[PDB]
């Protein structure tokens, strides 16, 4: 039984560095190569370099040749495998999932990866959202729809319900998008009746519970 | 009338009994003497295929080394993760004997006569001697401190260009000479001159077979001291030469500029010998014994490079020294050789 | 130097249908899944070769520097994105979409809170709700002008009950630039459009 596990979630401050370990078991472990991928939000998997177990020799691209050091830590009787990937100066663009993945073969193929572990640049510490109503000034008939703006905080993630959750039908609540800032922003919108307007109250429940922040707002142009 | 198969082969030597040194002495209680009158039974017309990385010689004289260096150069403490052990340390006379491996009766050594041969594929000039030629076994990394050279151009030896995983082997021309001292901290010592030369050469073929690209030349990317510097053994001693200088240049139009410090007119790389060893034989740490008192001396010839290329997207490859595996020394050498079943 | 390229990008079917791919390569090619928010999985090696543990249905021909990958019998387990792999290079691969009527989407465009005029930033949010496929261009046009490299747009999943999705972009500025212009306009691309669509609207 082969399994790589890798480490928990990182978040870490620009400019400074993250450590990402796999540690490796289950196998002949040093007569396979371990590769390094990292997965930014859509877009393709990104060659990050392998590493020789037994000998230590890293082969990275330029682009990462100089910031990512790959190094590895024997066990005891070699049953457990540490592999760590260090990245010295981060960036904006260095926020991404990182994939230990093991070559089988000369054929370059992946037969056992890792979940994977959340690097999440940014240098925000810890705040609330920033709650904005979104409602139409000119009424040309939109069949109606109105939400809320989740706006700058940190870090994930937001529960959102609509009438202390009794309205869940046309409900969209949208993933969350790291801005430049290194703050999270999302928004939920709902389709409501043309005519219901007035006739009812729209209020929205977003809740933060890493900041303890929760806040009701009610939205009518 | 033959085909391909494996056998257990026998290894040939021109050692002595009676000397002190740990290779004659292993090299007649393991060896047999020379012919040295073999048959070169050579004709064309006839067409085979061969393979340096897939070859079944090369384990063979990978596992009679590892007897030698266990056996000979003997350690004070070694580590074997959950147990160590500790014996008695000498030190003792360190140079390698050239060696040569047989194939019994009813077996044959085919060999290749196409100096251009790269390591795989067909043959157009085939032979058949009993034995291998003399080929002296030198533990060496990023250079080959000992081996021989094709008269014709230089070729590269690679399992797969493509794959970057694969440790690339360049079979040089021209002799380049190394010396490395301790006079009574190390050093070495290489010609610039002639190191211009043999990477100006160098890279119109790597250039053959990616055109487009300009070829660099950086230090290791990291790893063990053992990979990211030049590591080697001179009577007993390893040596741990920084190499950052010594990888530092580019080729381009033909022409290669290297910085490498030079500070005068000769490329200084800083030795030193080390105590604590990972060994490349047996998975652990050895413990020895600091140097010998006086003057630690040897002239080296390097006949060939050990690289690997980067892989990654920029019309520009760039190439790392690397290693590791010693096998992939012994694979220059067998290259030209398979072992074949008679029948 | 290695050109591998992936055909195509978007691709819908329904449950039991045979699905095809096709990824040009000049090197060893393996096919993979990869499921949302998690690790890609490995199904065919050498371009034909079938991972152990991989339903047999799923297939792939090797011929030239042409690859197949073929899905006989499309299961719901099989919605996921596929992509192909030469050595280091991989490409961003083909997208599995539940099958669904080419539907248009229901735009609309939010003028910024006040609230947030008074932290000194504007953000106008335009919605594309319920729509298919996923396919969709959203462009910011500020006094006829196209808006480039200060928006931003998040894609919800397809639901299980209509099978469509939800865009919601947000254009972000100052509001010192925010109080330089007077129409904030918002284009809409859809293949369920006879033409692009503007929603717009003025201080
Ligand atoms: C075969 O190779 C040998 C060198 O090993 C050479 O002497 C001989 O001329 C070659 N045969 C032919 C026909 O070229
Ligand atoms: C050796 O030559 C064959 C063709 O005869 C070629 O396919 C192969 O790539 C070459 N190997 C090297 C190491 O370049
Ligand atoms: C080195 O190889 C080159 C390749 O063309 C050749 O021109 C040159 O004569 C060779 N020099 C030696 C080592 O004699
Ligand atoms: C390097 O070596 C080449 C080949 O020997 C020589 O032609 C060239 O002048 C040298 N380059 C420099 C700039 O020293
Ligand atoms: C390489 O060969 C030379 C010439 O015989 C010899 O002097 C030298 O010691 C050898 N280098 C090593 C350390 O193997
Ligand atoms: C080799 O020397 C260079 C120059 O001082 C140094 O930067 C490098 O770290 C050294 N390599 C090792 C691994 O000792
Ligand atoms: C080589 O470089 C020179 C400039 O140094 C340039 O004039 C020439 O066109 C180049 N030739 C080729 C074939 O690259
Ligand atoms: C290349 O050599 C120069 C001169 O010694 C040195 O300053 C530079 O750091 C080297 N580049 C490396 C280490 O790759
Ligand atoms: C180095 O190799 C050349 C090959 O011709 C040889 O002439 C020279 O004697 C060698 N140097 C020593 C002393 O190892
Ligand atoms: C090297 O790998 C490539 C991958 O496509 C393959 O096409 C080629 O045949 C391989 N070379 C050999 C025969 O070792
Ligand atoms: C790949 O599949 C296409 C249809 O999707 C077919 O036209 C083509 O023949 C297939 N390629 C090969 C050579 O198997």
């Known amino acids: 039984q082969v399994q790589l596990l890798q480490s928990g979630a990182a978040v870490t401050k620009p400019g400074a560095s993250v450590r990402v370990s796999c540690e490796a078991s289950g196998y002949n472990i040093r007569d396979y190569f371990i590769h390094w991928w990292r997965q930014a939000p859509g877009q393709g998997l990104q060659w990050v370099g392998w590493?020789?177990?037994?000998?230590?020799?890293?082969?990275?691209?330029?682009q990462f040749q100089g910031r990512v050091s790959l190094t590895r830590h024997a066990s005891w009787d070699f049953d457990t495998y540490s592999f760590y990937m260090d990245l010295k100066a981060l960036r904006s663009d260095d926020t991404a999932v990182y994939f230990c993945?093991?070559?089988?073969?000369?054929?370059?193929?992946?037969?056992?990866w890792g979940s994977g572990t959340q690097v999440t640049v940014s240098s925000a510490s810890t705040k609330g959202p920033s709650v904005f109503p979104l409602a139409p000034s000119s009424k040309s008939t939109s069949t109606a729809a109105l939400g809320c703006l989740v706006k700058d905080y940190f870090p994930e993630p937001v529960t959102v319900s609509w009438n202390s959750g009794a309205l869940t039908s046309g409900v969209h609540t949208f993933p969350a998008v790291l801005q430049s800032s290194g703050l999270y922003s999302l928004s939920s919108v709902v389709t409501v009746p043309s005519s219901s307007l007035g006739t009812q109250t729209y209020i929205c429940n977003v809740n933060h519970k890493p900041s303890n922040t929760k806040v009701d707002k009610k939205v009518e142009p | 009338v033959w085909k391909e198969a494996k056998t257990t082969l026998f290894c040939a030597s021109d050692a002595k009994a009676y000397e002190k040194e740990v290779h004659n002495v292993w090299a007649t209680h393991a060896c047999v003497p020379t012919d040295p009158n073999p048959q070169e039974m050579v004709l064309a017309n006839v067409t085979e295929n061969f393979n340096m990385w897939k070859n079944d010689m090369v384990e063979q004289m990978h596992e009679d080394i590892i007897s030698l260096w266990d056996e000979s150069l003997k350690p004070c403490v070694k580590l074997t993760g959950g147990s160590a052990i500790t014996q008695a340390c000498p030190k003792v006379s360190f140079d390698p004997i050239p060696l040569h491996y047989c194939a019994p009766a009813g077996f044959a050594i085919l060999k290749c006569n196409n100096k251009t041969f790269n390591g795989t594929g067909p043959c157009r000039n085939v032979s058949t001697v009993q034995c291998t030629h003399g080929i002296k076994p030198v533990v060496s990394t990023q250079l080959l401190l000992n081996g021989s050279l094709a008269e014709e151009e230089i070729i590269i030896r690679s399992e797969n260009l493509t794959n970057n995983a694969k440790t690339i082997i360049v079979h040089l021309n021209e002799s380049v000479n190394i010396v490395c001292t301790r006079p009574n901290q190390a050093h070495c010592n290489i010609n610039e001159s002639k190191w211009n030369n043999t990477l100006q050469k160098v890279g119109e073929e790597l250039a053959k077979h990616f055109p487009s690209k300009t070829i660099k030349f950086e230090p290791s990317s990291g790893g063990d001291l053992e990979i990211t510097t030049h590591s080697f053994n001179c009577r007993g001693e390893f040596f741990y030469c920084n190499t950052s200088d010594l990888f530092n240049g580019t080729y381009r139009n033909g022409t290669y500029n290297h910085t490498g410090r030079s500070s005068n007119g000769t490329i200084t790389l800083q030795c030193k010998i080390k105590q604590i060893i990972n060994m490349w034989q047996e998975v652990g740490r050895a413990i020895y014994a600091p140097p010998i008192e006086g003057e630690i001396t040897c002239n080296s010839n390097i006949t060939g490079l050990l690289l690997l290329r980067d892989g990654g997207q920029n019309d520009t490859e760039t190439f790392r020294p690397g290693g590791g595996d010693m096998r992939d020394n012994w694979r220059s050498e067998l290259y030209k050789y398979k072992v074949v079943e008679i029948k | 130097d290695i050109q591998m390229t992936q055909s195509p990008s978007s691709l819908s079917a329904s449950v039991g249908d045979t699905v095809t791919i096709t990824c040009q390569a000049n090197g060893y090619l393996n096919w993979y899944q990869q499921r949302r928010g998690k690790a890609p999985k490995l199904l065919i090696y050498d371009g034909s070769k079938l991972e152990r543990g991989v339903p047999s249905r799923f297939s792939g021909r090797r011929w030239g520097q042409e690859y197949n990958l073929t899905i006989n019998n499309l299961q719901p387990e099989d919605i996921a994105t596929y992509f192909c792999q030469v050595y280091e290079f991989v490409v961003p691969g083909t997208r599995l979409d539940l099958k669904r009527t080419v539907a248009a989407p229901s735009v609309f465009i939010f003028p910024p809170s006040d609230e947030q005029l008074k932290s000194g930033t504007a953000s106008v949010v335009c919605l594309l709700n319920n729509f298919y496929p996923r396919e969709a261009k959203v462009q910011w046009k500020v006094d006829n002008a196209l808006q480039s490299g200060n928006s931003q747009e998040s894609v919800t999943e397809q639901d299980s009950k209509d099978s469509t999705y939800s865009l919601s972009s947000t254009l972000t500025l100052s509001k010192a630039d925010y109080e330089k212009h007077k129409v904030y306009a918002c284009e809409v691309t859809h293949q369920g459009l006879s033409s692009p669509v503007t929603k717009s609207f003025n201080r």
């Open positions: 590493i020789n177990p037994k000998t230590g020799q890293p082969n990275n691209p330029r």
């Open positions: 993945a093991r070559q089988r073969s000369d054929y370059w193929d992946f037969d056992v």
